[PDB]
């Protein structure tokens, strides 16, 4: 809510999927053409926005933790998820998605499955 970030301004505006990656204490958008590609060394924040019959928007916030992501990344993804939720007035359900234990719902967002990628952006520490 007091948060002033260009990505928070874009989050949950229209129905669809939005993916951001944690890059050294910042929340950086992932190119829409790369959605589904996940660096096992990084952490990401995923927002699924759905339009309800009554006009409201329904949110599902998934923070995905790659097997080799550093503490600052997994830590940041969690906090960003709580901040995004708060910013969206808390109409979102938060889901922690660990590489290899992803929810069927989260997997359901990707028609061609997930593409794991070794590596990622360096820790912010």
């Amino acid at each position: 809510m007091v948060v002033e970030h260009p990505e928070f301004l874009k989050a949950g505006k229209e129905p669809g999927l939005q993916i951001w990656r944690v890059e050294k204490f910042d929340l950086v958008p992932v190119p829409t053409n790369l959605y589904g590609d996940f660096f096992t060394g990084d952490a990401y924040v995923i927002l699924k926005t759905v339009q309800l019959r009554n006009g409201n928007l329904q949110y599902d916030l998934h923070y995905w933790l790659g097997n080799e992501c550093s503490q600052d990344e997994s830590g940041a993804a969690a906090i960003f998820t709580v901040q995004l939720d708060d910013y969206l007035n808390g109409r979102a359900v938060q889901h922690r998605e660990v590489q290899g234990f992803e929810s069927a719902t989260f997997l359901g967002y990707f028609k061609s499955g997930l593409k794991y990628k070794k590596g990622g952006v360096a820790s912010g520490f």
């Binding site: 007091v2 948060v3 002033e4 970030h5 928070f8 204490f25 910042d26 929340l27 952490a43 923070y63 933790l65 503490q71 600052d72 997994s74 830590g75 940041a76 993804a77 969690a78 906090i79 960003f80 998820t81 709580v82 901040q83 939720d85 708060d86 938060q94 922690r96 820790s123 912010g124 520490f125």
Partner: protein, 372 residues
């Protein structure tokens, strides 16, 4: 821009550093030493105060005091002294030049919080300030927004249920035994073995023995008799005077007090039972995640075998259908600090700080809702 400073004032150990670092640069005892009667010459006691390691070292001529009891400040003048030392001597920076993130214990009085806020803006003139609940910083550092944190340090053991980023105050429970109590208990049973540890130096030996050889028995019985028969559980400890001494079941009997406080003549539930009680005080819907996200933080949760035993004890209390998981990261001694370093470095947090400007217009009372 500038690095925010992050300080976790523990009742026993203070952790200080710069946001963005992976660990606290300075970790020292939360002690303030003053000469009984001062002097001038080197080693005669020139300064009028010492803090941390130095105070500890020269305790021969100073009277040490601990401004923090159970995570609550009980001597604000001495507290200010530790803060001064922390900025200028430990981190070696001018406070007025850096936003400062401090931590607080659960159930910290609103007056202490406001007083802490006042000193930071008025005495140290910080440009930005924030206070965070310790348990929550530890949860974030573990990469979760929901879980129940068991924080056992030197002064207080609390269990703090947190759902989607917010702790549930109504379910927060405290166990009135912690690290110092275990050190004192181990010093006892060690005296029954036929020793004597009574001075400060000797108690530090016990602390070391506690932190180096103690463990938590998966089955307190199987171990007790295991130590009674085979001398396989035995461990030898080399002392300052050089002579070696052997530690037996005192190793697992000291930390056992965490599960059965009655051993310290204390009538309180143990850490396992208290975690279950806290979870039960929470809404049905959240209990499941809490059970699968029991996070350990603090130095007293460092006992090898503690996670293994908590798992067992808790699965025994939880419904059969329940997935019980205990998370005890190797670095849980700095979990709180690390959570703060991450939090304070986020681009998004920069609007979260209480500004000197707003302090000026609304005073210390704004701290509560600002850092909700």
């Amino acid at each position: 821009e500038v690095a925010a400073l992050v300080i976790d004032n523990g009742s026993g150990m203070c952790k200080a550093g710069f946001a963005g670092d992976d660990a606290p640069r300075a970790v020292f005892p939360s002690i303030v030493g003053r000469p009984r009667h001062q002097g001038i010459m080197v080693g005669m006691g020139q300064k009028d105060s010492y803090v941390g390691d130095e105070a500890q070292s020269k305790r021969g001529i100073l009277t040490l005091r601990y401004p923090i009891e159970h995570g609550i400040v009980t001597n604000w003048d001495d507290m200010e002294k530790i803060w001064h030392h922390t900025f200028y001597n430990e981190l070696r920076v001018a406070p007025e030049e850096h936003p400062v993130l401090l931590t607080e214990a659960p159930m910290n009085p609103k007056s202490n919080r406001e007083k802490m806020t006042q000193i930071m803006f008025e005495t140290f003139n910080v440009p930005a300030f924030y206070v965070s609940i310790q348990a929550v910083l530890s949860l974030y550092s573990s990469g979760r927004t929901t879980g129940i944190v068991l924080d056992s340090g030197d002064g207080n053991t609390h269990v703090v249920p947190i759902y989607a980023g917010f702790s549930l105050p109504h379910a927060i429970l405290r166990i009135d035994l912690a690290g110092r109590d275990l050190t004192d208990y181990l010093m006892k049973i060690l005296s029954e073995r036929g020793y004597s540890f009574s001075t400060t130096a000797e108690r530090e030996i016990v602390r070391d023995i506690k932190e180096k050889l103690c463990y938590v028995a998966l089955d307190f019985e199987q171990e007790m008799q295991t130590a009674a028969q085979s001398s396989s559980i035995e461990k030898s400890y080399e002392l300052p005077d050089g002579q070696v001494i052997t530690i037996g079941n005192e190793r697992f009997r000291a930390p056992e007090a965490l599960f059965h406080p009655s051993v310290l003549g204390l009538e309180s539930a143990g850490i396992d039972q208290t975690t279950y009680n806290s979870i039960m005080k929470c809404d049905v819907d959240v209990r499941k995640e809490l059970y699968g996200n029991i996070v350990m933080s603090g130095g007293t949760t460092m006992f090898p075998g503690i996670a293994e035993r908590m798992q067992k004890e808790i699965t025994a209390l939880a419904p059969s259908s329940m997935k019980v998981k205990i998370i005890a990261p190797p670095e849980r001694k700095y979990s709180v600090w690390i959570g703060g370093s991450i939090l304070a470095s986020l681009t998004t947090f920069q609007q979260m700080w209480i500004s000197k400007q707003e302090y000026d217009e609304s005073g210390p009372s704004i701290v509560h809702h600002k850092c909700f």
